[PDB]
Amino acid sequence: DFLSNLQEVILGTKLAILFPAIPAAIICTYCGVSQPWIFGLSLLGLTPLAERVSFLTEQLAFYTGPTLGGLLNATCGNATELIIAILALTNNKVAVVKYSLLGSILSNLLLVLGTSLFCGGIANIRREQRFDRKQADVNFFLLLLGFLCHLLPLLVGYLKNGEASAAVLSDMQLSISRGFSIVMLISYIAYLVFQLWTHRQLFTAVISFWSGFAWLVGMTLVIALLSEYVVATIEEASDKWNLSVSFISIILLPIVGNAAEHAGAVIFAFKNKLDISLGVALGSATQIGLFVVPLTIIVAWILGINMDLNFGPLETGCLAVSIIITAFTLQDGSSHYMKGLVLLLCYFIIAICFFVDK
Amino acid sequence: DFLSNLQEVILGTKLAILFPAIPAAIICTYCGVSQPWIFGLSLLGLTPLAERVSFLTEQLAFYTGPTLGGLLNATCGNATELIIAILALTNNKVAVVKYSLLGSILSNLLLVLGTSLFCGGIANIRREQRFDRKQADVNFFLLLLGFLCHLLPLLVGYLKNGEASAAVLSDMQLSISRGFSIVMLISYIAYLVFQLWTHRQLFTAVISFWSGFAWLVGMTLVIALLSEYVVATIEEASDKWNLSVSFISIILLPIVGNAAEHAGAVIFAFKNKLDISLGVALGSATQIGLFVVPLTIIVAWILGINMDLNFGPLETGCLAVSIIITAFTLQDGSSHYMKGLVLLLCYFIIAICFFVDK
Amino acid sequence: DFLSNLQEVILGTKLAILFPAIPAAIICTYCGVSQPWIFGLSLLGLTPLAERVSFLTEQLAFYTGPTLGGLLNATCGNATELIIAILALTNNKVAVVKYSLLGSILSNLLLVLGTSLFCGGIANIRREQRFDRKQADVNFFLLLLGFLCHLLPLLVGYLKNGEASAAVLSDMQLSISRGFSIVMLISYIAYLVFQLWTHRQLFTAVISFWSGFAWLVGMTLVIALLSEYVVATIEEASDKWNLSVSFISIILLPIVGNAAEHAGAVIFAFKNKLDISLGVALGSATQIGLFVVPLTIIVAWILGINMDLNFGPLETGCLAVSIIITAFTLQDGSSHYMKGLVLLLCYFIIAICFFVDK
Numbered sequence A, B, C: 001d002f003l004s005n006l007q008e009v010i011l012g013t014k015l016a017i018l019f020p021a022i023p024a025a026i027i028c029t030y031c032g033v034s035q036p037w038i039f040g041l042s043l044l045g046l047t048p049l050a051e052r053v054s055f056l057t058e059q060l061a062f063y064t065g066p067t068l069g070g071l072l073n074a075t076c077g078n079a080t081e082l083i084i085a086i087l088a089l090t091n092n093k094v095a096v097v098k099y100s101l102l103g104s105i106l107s108n109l110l111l112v113l114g115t116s117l118f119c120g121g122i123a124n125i126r127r128e129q130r131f132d133r134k135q136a137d138v139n140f141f142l143l144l145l146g147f148l149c150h151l152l153p154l155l156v157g158y159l160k161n162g163e164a165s166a167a168v169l170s171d172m173q174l175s176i177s178r179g180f181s182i183v184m185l186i187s188y189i190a191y192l193v194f195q196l197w198t199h200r201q202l203f204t205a206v207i208s209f210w211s212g213f214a215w216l217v218g219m220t221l222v223i224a225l226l227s228e229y230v231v232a233t234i235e236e237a238s239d240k241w242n243l244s245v246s247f248i249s250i251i252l253l254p255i256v257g258n259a260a261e262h263a264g265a266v267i268f269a270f271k272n273k274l275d276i277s278l279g280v281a282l283g284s285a286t287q288i289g290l291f292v293v294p295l296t297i298i299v300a301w302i303l304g305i306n307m308d309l310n311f312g313p314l315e316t317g318c319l320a321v322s323i324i325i326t327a328f329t330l331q332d333g334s335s336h337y338m339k340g341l342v343l344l345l346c347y348f349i350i351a352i353c354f355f356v357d358k
């Protein structure tokens, strides 16, 4: 395309002061800079690269067809939650995998969704704001299937009364979590048939094709380079800031991940198209909940690393109410600003409980 | 009727190879056959007898009237869950009573209901499939009254902190469970007035009358003969198969019980009448939940046998999500196949958690 | 007004035999009467004074305007739950504050609401009974925000496994409860703008003005005089009746408090206006849940008294099901008598569990 949209669209992001963070993460590695600065200049280097992957992926959709063009249009908003989950599972920091994959479900149900209803409720306060229910009820049937897979290994850990030690109940949680994962991958392959082929009918570009595959390695081998620096240097970056590792992982780190889905769900909220702001905010809390999370169990199954679906007692109660307050909000096909301020303030309640949790 | 429908309708079951299991359970008793074979040839002998009672009971409805013909039409699908619960309560195997009466609630909410939506969604994928909400909302108000009676004696067992030993909190669970049962029998007598008399309007035969009372003892004193053999020989039949007694009782045994309600809820799903497949699958999880279960407490109250509504922590969390995922599925009066595959896969999640639970 | 409605309207209460209980509480103080009688003649002295405040407050609404006349019309039904909560927090009986503010949420969701549907369902059984959903969905979004603030300090108390003693986890519950309260007062100030100003349009008197301020001190300094006698003499009045202090506080004491809201929600149920019986029964379980309860934490924050949002395990499970069975009842805008009998019998289940709880 003769180097024209290769310089303008790269400088055509609504956030573009974050591009000099990328040279100040490799150079600061080979100079002996202390580890909080490498952590500060790696989150600010993945924030436009989480968008430039999740925008240029749509540019390859117009060169494939109707089948794959319904798949890659709705599967690569989560190409940063996947790389950080695998470059922390192989580094044996298994707890950070359980928080960043939980904070990407809560941010897509409370902060992303409850800003499309608030900011796109005040601008359109003198119009009627309608979406459809049948298009986004399937996204809540699957999250209640995911919650049952997280509830049951939690309650097995509190069965120490029943004449069993810890070595029995730990290989009982680990056996049923490695069997719930195959059941969770089947209710997402079936979802990717209902959404694409069977019920499609009830449901131009600017860039050349050869550009779209060159950059989507040049914007992926830089996410995989910086996702090591976030994982391998999160401990000293949690002792010089006086923050907990169960707050950086669950609150600050999903903001870098879900920043592509958080300017697409808001711009289509000012345009009064809330069918689209519910496809981005809900259809990406299902890909995390039922394809990205049970795939980590299967990769741990192969590598010999122990990992089960036990998040914890305080993390599961936040997951249970996030699905119930979202379901009762979206059950009549009409919205206003007070539906979205209740979802924001339920996210400032979770964000206090982990700021104190030391 | 001159021995004509007495030989044709008896041979007129869609499952009729299970009739020679009945002679091979009495003869194998008086020959010293080892106890797994008596257990194998007793479940296969109760499967057509759970249907021939729950079909010939409708034949007596056309000889009584409108009042009783709305009662016996909807009260004797559960004439096998009642005999096995009483022929195990008097044999002091109280735990098997708590599993088989729970696995008859889960099978009617997930496996019976989620097959009428899946098998009757693929055949009618090119039509619109509608039921009514007001006819089956009362069935969920009562199950939330039943769940509160099971939640509260569970949480009293975890109040050992409050300066009370086990002998105090065991006669505190036992006192409130014997008072919740009278409150549960009143919200089912009131349901049998709302359904029959007060709101009836908003809601031929082939066999003679004298045939219909002869067989309905000859098909009931054979259920009561074989329900002893299932109860008194479940222990050695759980050591020669390497299965748990909390899997045989909760999964394999309700399949023999709910096999009359599992070919009537499916044939009316191919006929695109989902008002009727929701009256069989939901109106029989309410008779178990609010008439068969609180009647066992009252019979234990009279016989001096200690029994309360405490199922357990792992069994109550499966009961809580089964009511919530069923309520959010049925709240718009329209169905398709993906609503029923989520209910089947939530039953293959419960069936793993108890296959491992040794 | 020349002493005419000052004698007729004071004698114009539908309960007026309870007025001689007021002289028999001050005289019995200065005569050495034993403390159960002062407790018996103080609940019967606050029952017409909980009504005469919550009726004459509407008489001052017609002398202020549209703004304040939407506020005092809906903020002083709870002028007795507030005085008893503060005259027990300063007397260091902190547990009674946690029960009487819980039994005012349960009575407004089950006993007040489930009598407007039952008594106003039998009188209007031959008509169709409709309310609106959008007017009373906001009242359930806020109660799910209140429940998350009560769920999370409960689960922190069961984190004694995580290498922390009791002195760590008690100043961890106390820190997050004093930060959840500011988040709860903001989602009620925002509710008092949505209800009054922004969405008003989608949503004579008999007494002079100068009468309305004289009596509303003369009916408030008698509530504050008798609310000391209920608090300071509840212990011996729970040893001469053989009742628990977690039954008098949660069942018998809210009946005196919610007796103004329990003849206004019933008379508008016989008149077939269920938009109004849902504004009294639901809009007063939100003022308790999100303005009266988080204000007690802030007053305890200033006075140096330790108080957090931890009610208990058995009290939170009763709060969780009370919101779920109320939400599934009111989701179609139509009512009948069987919706209200299920809500009454769920209140006779809570009232047994605390009658035994000694």
Ligand SMILES: [Ca+2]
Pocket: A077, A078, A079, A080, A081, A257, A258, A259, A261
């Ligand atoms: Ca993302």
Ligand SMILES: [Ca+2]
Pocket: B077, B078, B079, B080, B081, B257, B258, B259, B261
């Ligand atoms: Ca049955």
Ligand SMILES: [Ca+2]
Pocket: C077, C078, C079, C080, C081, C257, C258, C259, C261
């Ligand atoms: Ca009140």
